[PDB]
Design a protein around this ligand. Structure first.
Ligand code: NAP
Ligand code: NAP
Ligand code: OAA
Ligand code: OAA
Ligand code: OAA
Ligand code: OAA
Lengths: 411, 412
């Protein structure tokens, strides 16, 4: 009999990750777990067919059932419009979901003992807490077609006192302009999540901004964090002998690069996006990172891989050429979602299954069976032979066999 | 004098630890050997406050006139700096002010010594960042939103046609923050040309990073302008030199850079060039070992600087009587790169030799085992560094001065 899993929102995606997602459900999930599975096809063609309504529906379902697991998706630009004959240049589904749910996206490498890093000093984990709301990911941007003025205006709801600011007077030619924003409550929730995560690990917490340049916008982040620290967390931090520090982002990225790891890094949305990929690659691979959106309600989570649809590998797949795409991040999307589902429901067998799934992945790699990205960590990319790694499908097969044995040996 | 006649140079003095080092460089490495028509602007925080920041604008105009500026790191004030110095205003970054006036691309690259281990194992070839020097976050209009209300952004055509208004956000609960930022077509085009030309001159591929999937209009403009200029002007030359141009999304690009062997030009939007130049500098060894030169679109005007800041934390150690070991190399290369460009403009052979000899002295000294503590930590690991492994700030300047004097004396 299969494990009774409960309610989980599943979002399918695009290109190489869509194929991997199918293999994960077929070989690793469905043979062992029966789920109340609420599935939403966020493939690009279905998003286009539904005028992106399928994306909004999925987000509302995550809010209802409190657990979502999402496959990487195409965010379309002009080249994608021509490729898929799109009606519109749809917004990122991740930006849409995060805008609705809010919260902090926590990202952390998945570590194997036999995988050398590219950054020599990182012997302890770096955990990025990426603010999931606003800034560049909910911006209003446009092409300035020629000479003219761009202004930004604030009108208070108690229609008494409006302010207009000059952004730029385009005297010659055109260019681009944009407005973006963030909300106090969202920044407050982001602070609370970062302080709580640091206390949960017993590690120092660092916030990065560029408040010397964006004195008002980034100053608000720095001020809210410091206020919340002083009033709610300072004594707990002092009790655990850990600290909280604000740093300018350019200092911070260099400090992280030379650190030993073992800190929480609170990142504004954009910095969290960019630096999580830098950090993932520094440890090993984009295929070896977890990403979990923890919503401010302390109950709803959305788990995903940090990487994209791996288009470049997909193009090799389309030509029949052998590919070796790392599926572990996609697998930990499922394992982290199912683990949270089990924690909500006190589902003992599902908790065991989710941890066993993660253990199989680590054990398999550490025994010497891995995809090409990890073989390249060990040997160096010029020295990688075909005999050093498994292709995507061989590796999925090896994981399937090792999970079968683990679950059988457990019964 | 019998010194090298070096010509006209705009000098911009700065703050905290770099101000101390800056004077040591002039006193020990420059002025004993080079006679300069020095146009000095004190961009220390106190003189900027006293002149209501006018000294900063005057300095930028002087760089325009004399085509060469060398700049010390400066404090950009926030609330805490206003309190520390009782400033009249939260002045804007002098770097932003100068760059907004001059425009161009800031090219940044590590300074490599053969005995200094990297933190990033793969980087055996140079990574050159071309940072767009204009616009975006560094000439933004940002403000606090004090409570519920609407933020909108409007474009008013100069030709009288219909104004366009877009909603930014309806704040329905509480306040927050909002901002507008922009960039200009001509500046983006100049940024493209500079990046393509740098790639061809070094003979390396070029990569532009944006987030055009998200900022489809704003960043799509960068991508489209680069691609059109590539197709119309540079693609044939790239193909002849066996190199390529590619646009990549920024999160892919930073991971690609991490695992690369190096050997590429990286065209960065203003903010990314700021942040990633610090990450790259540290990856090769130290923030003290990176050059930074703003190359203006006129192909004649340059401003050289270090990429790091005023090193406040070391300055605080100096103020309390604690020994410091701050790396001056980036500050020295600001002078050497500025003087080298002055020499190129003037066909000044002796000055060109002096500027190269100055850089060689820095590299030879470190490779001979004389270095500041950051570089000793590269070799031994910070926990294993002993006092005998390095020289303090002043000792290292003295050793460079000794080695420069010896090199120039042998050269005659
Ligand atoms: N969360 C999301 O849904 C998400 C995130 C990012 C991007 N995207 C979307 O994904 C599409 C492609 O974006 P992109 O090419 O910039 O980013 P990407 O899909 O993350 O791939 C970039 C490169 O990273 C390496 N990589 C990423 N994941 C890997 C894995 N699982 N195994 C092995 N290598 C991996 C590969 O490098 P090599 O080529 O060197 O092998 C790959 O070509 C775009 O349409 C974008 O909008 C979606
Ligand atoms: N171009 C510019 O004018 C510029 C650029 C950046 C910042 N700033 C300004 O500089 C001030 C301080 O900013 P910050 O502390 O964020 O950045 P910073 O001055 O670059 O220093 C940050 C840290 O980097 C290391 N570092 C930087 N330069 C070094 C050198 N020459 N030798 C050895 N180590 C070096 C030190 O790390 P450890 O503490 O670990 O030793 C230092 O504390 C601020 O007022 C800021 O506005 C100016
Ligand atoms: O923000 C992310 O995590 C990935 C992204 O930019 C997109 O969804 O296109
Ligand atoms: O951009 C403008 O038209 C004026 C302004 O705010 C600036 O000099 O940054
Ligand atoms: O932009 C730079 O090169 C350094 C910076 O942010 C500042 O001047 O405060
Ligand atoms: O923010 C608003 O009020 C409407 C809008 O532009 C969005 O939903 O991003």
């Amino acid at each position: 009999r299969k494990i009774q899993g409960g309610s989980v929102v599943e979002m399918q995606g695009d290109e190489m990750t869509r194929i991997i997602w199918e293999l994960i459900k077929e070989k690793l999930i469905l043979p062992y777990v029966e789920l109340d599975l609420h599935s939403y096809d966020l493939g690009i063609e279905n998003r286009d067919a539904t005028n992106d309504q399928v994306t909004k529906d999925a987000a509302e379902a995550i809010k209802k059932y409190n657990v979502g697991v999402k496959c990487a998706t195409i965010t379309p630009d002009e080249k994608r419009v021509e490729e898929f004959k799109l009606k519109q240049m749809w917004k990122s589904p991740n930006g849409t979901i995060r805008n609705i749910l809010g919260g902090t996206v926590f990202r952390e490498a998945i570590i194997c003992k036999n995988i050398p890093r590219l950054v020599t000093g990182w012997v302890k984990p770096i955990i990025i807490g990426r603010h999931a709301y606003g800034d560049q990911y909910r911006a209003t941007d446009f092409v300035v077609p020629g000479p003219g003025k761009v202004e930004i205006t604030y009108t208070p709801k108690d229609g008494t006192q409006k302010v207009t600011y000059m952004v730029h007077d385009f005297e010659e030619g055109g260019g681009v302009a944009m407005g973006m924003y963030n909300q106090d409550k969202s920044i407050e929730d982001f602070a609370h999540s970062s302080f709580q995560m640091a206390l949960s690990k017993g590690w120092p917490l660092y916030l990065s901004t560029k408040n010397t340049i964006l004195k008002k916008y980034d100053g608000r982040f720095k001020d809210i964090f410091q206020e919340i620290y002083d009033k709610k967390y300072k004594s707990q931090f002092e009790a655990q002998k850990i600290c909280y520090e604000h740093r300018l982002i350019d200092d911070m990225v260099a400090q992280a690069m030379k650190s030993e790891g073992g800190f929480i890094w609170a990142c504004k949305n954009y910095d969290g996006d960019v630096q999580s990929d830098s950090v993932a690659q520094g440890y090993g691979s984009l295929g070896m990172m977890t990403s979990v959106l923890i919503c401010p309600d302390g109950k709803t989570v959305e788990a995903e891989a940090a990487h994209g649809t791996v288009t470049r590998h997909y193009r090799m797949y389309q030509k029949g050429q052998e590919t070796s795409t790392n599926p572990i991040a996609s697998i930990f999307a499922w394992s982290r979602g199912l683990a949270h589902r089990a924690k909500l429901d006190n589902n003992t067998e599902l908790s065991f299954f989710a941890k066993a799934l993660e253990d199989v992945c680590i054990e398999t790699i550490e025994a010497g069976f891995m995809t090409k990205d990890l073989a390249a960590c060990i040997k160096g990319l010029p020295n990688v032979q075909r005999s050093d790694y498994l292709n995507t499908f061989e590796f999925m097969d090896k994981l399937g066999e090792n999970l079968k044995a683990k679950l059988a040996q457990a019964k």
